[PDB]
Design a protein around this ligand. Structure first.
Ligand SMILES: NC1=NC(=O)NC(=O)C1
Ligand SMILES: [Cl-]
Length: 228
C-alpha cells in the first residue's frame, strides 16, 4: 500500500531515491485512492500495480514512453503504460494502433499478444502522466496529484549521467517536455495513438527506429523492440 509503506519497499532502489522529493505526495495519492473507495468509486490499475513502472531499474532506463493515464476497462491496465496481460484479446484500440506503427516502422510481424513486459525488461520505462483512472472514465484522475510524481520521475531521469530518449504520446505527456531540456536527453513528441488522435500524426511517426537512431548517436545501445 502506497499510503502505508515507504518508497524503499514499494519501488526499486534507484527509483526510491529518485522519487524522494515526492515521498509525501505518493503517500497522499494512497490517501486519495482510499477516499475514492470510501466514497464509492473504484480505480485502475489494482493498487499493487499502480507504481509498477518504478519496479524496473531506474539506472537501466534508456527510453521513456509516456502516455496519458491507464486503460479505463477493468482487466486491461497493469501498471505499465499501454500494456495488457498476455491473455487479453481483443487488444484495446490504442494498443492495436501502436502495434500497427510498430510493424510499419520496424517491419516485424504483429506481436502475438499485448504484453509489453519485454520492453520494460530491456530498459523502456512505460509511464503514464497520471497513474490511476476511475473505471470507464478516461482522464478522471487528471489534476489529482499524480502529475507532481511523474514530473519528479522525469526530472530525475533527465539528471542522470546517462543517455535518455523520451517518447511523449499526447498532450498530457507533452507537458513533461520542459523538464526534458537536459543535453543528455532528447524528446520525440507525437499525437497519442488513440483513435481520437492517431491520424493527426501518430501513424507514420516511426518512434521506435527514431529512438534507436537517437540512442546510437549518444553512444548508447539501441532497444531491441522485437516482441514475440
Ligand atoms: N489507453 C491508454 N492510454 C494511455 O495514454 N496509456 C495507457 O496506459 C492506456
Ligand atoms: Cl467506479
Amino acid at each position: 500500500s502506497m499510503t502505508a509503506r515507504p518508497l524503499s519497499e514499494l519501488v526499486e532502489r534507484g527509483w526510491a531515491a529518485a522519487l524522494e522529493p515526492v515521498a509525501d505526495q505518493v503517500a497522499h495519492m494512497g490517501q486519495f485512492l482510499r477516499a475514492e473507495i470510501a466514497a464509492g468509486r473504484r480505480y485502475l490499475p489494482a493498487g499493487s500495480n499502480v507504481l509498477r513502472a518504478f519496479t524496473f531499474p531506474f539506472d537501466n532506463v534508456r527510453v521513456l514512453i509516456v502516455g496519458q493515464d491507464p486503460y479505463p476497462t477493468p482487466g486491461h491496465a497493469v501498471g505499465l503504460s499501454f500494456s495488457v496481460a498476455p491473455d487479453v484479446r481483443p487488444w484495446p484500440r490504442s494498443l492495436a494502433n501502436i502495434f500497427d506503427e510498430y510493424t510499419a516502422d520496424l517491419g516485424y510481424p504483429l506481436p502475438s499478444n499485448g504484453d509489453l513486459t519485454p520492453w520494460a525488461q530491456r530498459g523502456v520505462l512505460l509511464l503514464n502522466r497520471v497513474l490511476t483512472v476511475r473505471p470507464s472514465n478516461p482522464a478522471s484522475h487528471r489534476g489529482k496529484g499524480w502529475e507532481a510524481v511523474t514530473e519528479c520521475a522525469i526530472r530525475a531521469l533527465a539528471a542522470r549521467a546517462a543517455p535518455l530518449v523520451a517518447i511523449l504520446w499526447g498532450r498530457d505527456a507533452s507537458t513533461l517536455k520542459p523538464m526534458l531540456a537536459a543535453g543528455n536527453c532528447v524528446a520525440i513528441e507525437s499525437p497519442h495513438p488513440s483513435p481520437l488522435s492517431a491520424s493527426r500524426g501518430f501513424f507514420g511517426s516511426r518512434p521506435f527506429s527514431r529512438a534507436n537512431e537517437l540512442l546510437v548517436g549518444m553512444g548508447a545501445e539501441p532497444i531491441d523492440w522485437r516482441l514475440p
